[PDB]
Amino acid sequence: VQRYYKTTVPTKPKKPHDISAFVKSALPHLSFVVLGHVDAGKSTLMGRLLYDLNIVNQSQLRKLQRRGVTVSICTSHFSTHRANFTIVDAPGHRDFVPNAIMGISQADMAILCVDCSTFDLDGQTKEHMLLASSLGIHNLIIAMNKMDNVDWSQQRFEEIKSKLLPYLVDIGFFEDNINWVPISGFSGEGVYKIEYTDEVRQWYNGPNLMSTLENAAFKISKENEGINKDDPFLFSVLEIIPTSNDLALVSGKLESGSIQPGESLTIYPSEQSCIVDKIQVGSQQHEETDVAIKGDFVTLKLRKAYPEDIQNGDLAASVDYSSIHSAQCFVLELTTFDMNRPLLPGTPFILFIGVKEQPARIKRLISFIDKGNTASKKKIRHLGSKQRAFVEIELIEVKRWIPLLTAHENDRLGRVVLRKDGRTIAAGKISEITQ
Known about the structure:
This protein is an alpha+beta fold. The protein has helices at residues 19-25, 42-52, 58-64, 97-104, 123-134, 154-170, 198-203, 209-224; strands spanning 29-35, 75-79, 84-88, 109-115, 140-145, 178-182, 234-241, 248-256, 258-259, 264-268, 272-281, 288-289, 292-293, 297-303, 315-317, 325-326, 329-336, 348-353, 356-371, 374-375, 388-395, 403-404, 415-420, 423-433.
């Protein structure tokens, strides 16, 4: 209560591992979300994939051809020969956008399922893509689906791409981070275990979906092998599973560094320091690794923890890392979209960050940005559509403090999205905490 136990002195692992070695030795991992219209075939594509994975029945497939304390996101862990995967759910319904926000926020990258049959992407989907880049997703795989209904026309494929590509790019993505993959869905052609036809093979020479996914995972496995003891540990709390040793099971995702049994961490905003004596991974989370690293979804068994003051959305770090803060006010580098009304000093909205959402308002319009980050000298009285500006935000109606990290400490965690009147109006990066 009044105070929790807290140290800034790291505790040794029980069994120090060479982390670089451990990384190099381990299968690459990738998490992703699946986006797209319901008519786009997301579910049938997902069926096909799980079917080829022998996770889903043949009967199950045919029918489709028609608990912690509280739950923030849903995940599913599957694997292949070459890599481990985690599917995070992002419900595509108009009424569930916050929920989509939650899911996207925790995914490394996105698959965009698009119907190719006899191009204009719908609103809800343009929505989700806008959210994706806003929350830091840089990589996309475009699943060009139901090609059968266009008899695998390269013309159609090539035409859809030429319309979609420039859009994704206007939105913040880069051509080089996007992969385009033809699939049938009906037949599974292009998904995993059923190969492309010779006829398709003559114009399409690329990898199928599963291989593309596997390739993506490896790129990530690459970065991670540089990971040090000098690298900060960061962990997003996604679920606290329901003594006395102050044991607790906290599920989440590593956003940085590594963690081993015996090491400690501090949880914000409660500011309690804990010891992890077990790390459980996989669907089971009796599988127990002695190392977890950035990107892994795992469950930490903690000693000396008090779940009463640990919630979904909470952030944990190395004990000697002090860049996390609770604040009423902070500065956003703001990118505005197409809005109905302009933003003014005092305008309220809903702020979305990671898995959390919180009402807030503009405290100050500080300056337009004219180039990259340069603060323009044009006086700013109000902030309209398609503009970038530095802004000061105030949280309002605050029941509980929100742990915050600037986007320069961590690109992904420092991202926010702004909504008001049920529309996405802006995206920002946290530049400074006016703590």
